[PDB]
Amino acid sequence: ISGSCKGRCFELQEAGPPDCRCDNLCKSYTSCCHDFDELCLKTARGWECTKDRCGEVRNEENACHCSEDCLARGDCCTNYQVVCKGESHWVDDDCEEIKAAECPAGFVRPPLIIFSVDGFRASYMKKGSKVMPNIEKLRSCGTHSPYMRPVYPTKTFPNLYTLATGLYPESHGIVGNSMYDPVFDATFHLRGREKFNHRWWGGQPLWITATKQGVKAGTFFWSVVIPHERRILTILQWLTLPDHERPSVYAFYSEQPDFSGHKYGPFGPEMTNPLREIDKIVGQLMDGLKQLKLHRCVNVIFVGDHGMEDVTCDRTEFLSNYLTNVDDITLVPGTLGRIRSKFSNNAKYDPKAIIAALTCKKPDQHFKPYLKQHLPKRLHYANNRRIEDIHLLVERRWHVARKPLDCFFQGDHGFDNKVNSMQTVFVGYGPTFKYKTKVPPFENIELYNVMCDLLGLKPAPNNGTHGSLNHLLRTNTFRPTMPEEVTRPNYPGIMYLQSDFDLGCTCDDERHLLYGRPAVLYRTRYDILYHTDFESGYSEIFLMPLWTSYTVSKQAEVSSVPDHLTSCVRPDVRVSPSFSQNCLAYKNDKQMSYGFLFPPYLSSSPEAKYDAFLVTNMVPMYPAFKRVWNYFQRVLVKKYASERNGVNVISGPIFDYDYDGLHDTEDKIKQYVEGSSIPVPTHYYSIITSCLDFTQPADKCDGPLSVSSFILPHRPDNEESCNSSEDESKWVEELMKMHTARVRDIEHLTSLDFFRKTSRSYPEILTLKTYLHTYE
Ligand X SMILES: Cc1c(Sc2cccc(C(=O)O)c2F)c2ccc(Cl)c(F)c2n1CC(=O)N1CC2(CC2)c2ccccc21
Ligand Y SMILES: *[C@@H]1O[C@H](CO)[C@@H](O[C@@H]2O[C@H](CO)[C@@H](O)[C@H](O)[C@H]2NC(C)=O)[C@H](O)[C@H]1NC(C)=O
Quick check: 319 and 355 in contact, CB under 8 A? no
- The interface partner of residue 724, options being Ca ion, Na ion, ligand X, none and the CB cut-off 5 to 8 Å by kind, is Na ion
Q: Total residues at the site for Cl ion (CB under 5 A)?
A: 2
> In the set 18, 242, 363, 461, which binds ligand Y (CB under 6 A)?
461
- State the helix-helix crossing angle for 272-291 and 228-238, rounded to 10 degrees: 20
Interface positions with Na ion (CB under 5 A)? 586, 589, 592, 718, 721, 724
Question: How would DSSP label each residue in 70-130?
Answer: HHHHT-B-TTHHHHHS-PPPGGGSPP---SS----TT-SS--EEEEEEET-BGGGGGGHHH
Nearer to Zn ion by Cβ, of 116 and 740: the residue is: 116
Nearer to ligand NKN by Cβ, of 95 and 190: the residue is: 190
Binding mask 633-672 for ligand Y (x = CB under 6 A): ----------------------------xx----------
Nearer to Zn ion by Cβ, of 308 and 766: the residue is: 308
CB of 401 to ligand NKN, least distance (A): 16
148: phi then psi, degrees, rounded to nearest 5: -125, 135
Interface with Ca ion includes 39 (CB under 5 A)? no
d(CA 325, CA 327): 6
- The interface partner of residue 658, options being Ca ion, ligand X, Na ion, none and the CB cut-off 5 to 8 Å by kind, is Ca ion
Q: What angle do CA 657, 663, 667 make, to 5 degrees?
A: 55
Exactly one of 143, 156, 209, 234 is catalytic; which is it?
Answer: 156
Q: Are strands 249-257 and 390-394 parallel, antiparallel or unpaired?
A: unpaired
Residues followed by a break in the chain, C–N over 2.5 Å?
Answer: 406, 509
Scanning residues 463 to 492, which ones bind Zn ion (CB under 5 A)? none
Nearer to Zn ion by Cβ, of 305 and 317: the residue is: 305
690: phi then psi, degrees, rounded to nearest 5: -155, -175
> In the set 48, 136, 170, 258, which binds Zn ion (CB under 5 A)?
258
d(CA 252, CA 521): 41
Q: Which residues are CB-neighbours of 598 under 8 A, at least 6 positions away?
A: 531, 533, 534, 536, 548, 550, 611, 612, 617, 651
Q: What angle do CA 294, 299, 302 make, to 5 degrees?
A: 120
Q: How many CB atoms lie within 10 A of CB 96?
A: 10
> In the set 305, 527, 572, 664, which binds Zn ion (CB under 5 A)?
305
Tell me whether residue 749 is annotated as binding. no
Tell me whether residue 35 is annotated as binding. no
Interface positions with ligand NKN (CB under 6 A)? 114, 116, 118-119, 155-156, 160, 163-164, 177, 190, 206, 224, 251, 253, 255, 258, 451
- The interface partner of residue 236, options being Na ion, ligand X, ligand NKN, none and the CB cut-off 5 to 8 Å by kind, is none
Tell me whether residue 258 is annotated as binding. yes
Nearer to ligand NKN by Cβ, of 119 and 459: the residue is: 119
Quick check: 612 and 513 in contact, CB under 8 A? no
Tell me whether residue 699 is annotated as binding. no
CB of 591 to Na ion, least distance (A): 7
- State the helix-helix crossing angle for 447-455 and 156-165, rounded to 10 degrees: 40
- The interface partner of residue 664, options being ligand X, ligand NKN, Ca ion, none and the CB cut-off 5 to 8 Å by kind, is Ca ion
Nearest residue to 417 (alpha-carbon basis) of 268, 309, 318, 261: 309
d(CA 288, CA 271): 26
CB of 446 to ligand NKN, least distance (A): 13
Quick check: 188 and 178 in contact, CB under 8 A? yes
Quick check: 367 and 398 in contact, CB under 8 A? yes
Scanning residues 663 to 682, which ones bind Ca ion (CB under 5 A)? 664
The reply to whether omega before 600 is within 30° of 0 (cis) is no
Per the annotation, the verdict on 156 as an active-site residue is yes
Binding mask 161-200 for ligand X (x = CB under 6 A): x--x------------------------------xx-x--
> In the set 221, 259, 491, 530, which binds ligand X (CB under 6 A)?
221
Nearer to Ca ion by Cβ, of 60 and 667: the residue is: 667
- The interface partner of residue 258, options being ligand X, Zn ion, Ca ion, none and the CB cut-off 5 to 8 Å by kind, is Zn ion
The single-letter code of the amino acid at 651 is S
CB of 506 to ligand Y, least distance (A): 42
> In the set 49, 148, 167, 597, which binds ligand Y (CB under 6 A)?
167
HEC string of 237-272? HHCCCCCCCCCCEEEEEEEEEHHHHHHHCCCCHHHH
Scanning residues 176 to 205, which ones bind Cl ion (CB under 5 A)? 176-177
Q: Which residues are catalytic?
A: 156
Binding site for Zn ion (CB under 5 A): 118, 156, 258, 305
Binding site for Cl ion (CB under 5 A): 176-177
Binding site for ligand X (CB under 6 A): 28, 160-161, 164, 195-196, 198, 201, 205, 208, 221, 223-224
Binding site for ligand Y (CB under 6 A): 167-168, 171, 202-203, 380, 461-463, 661-662, 748
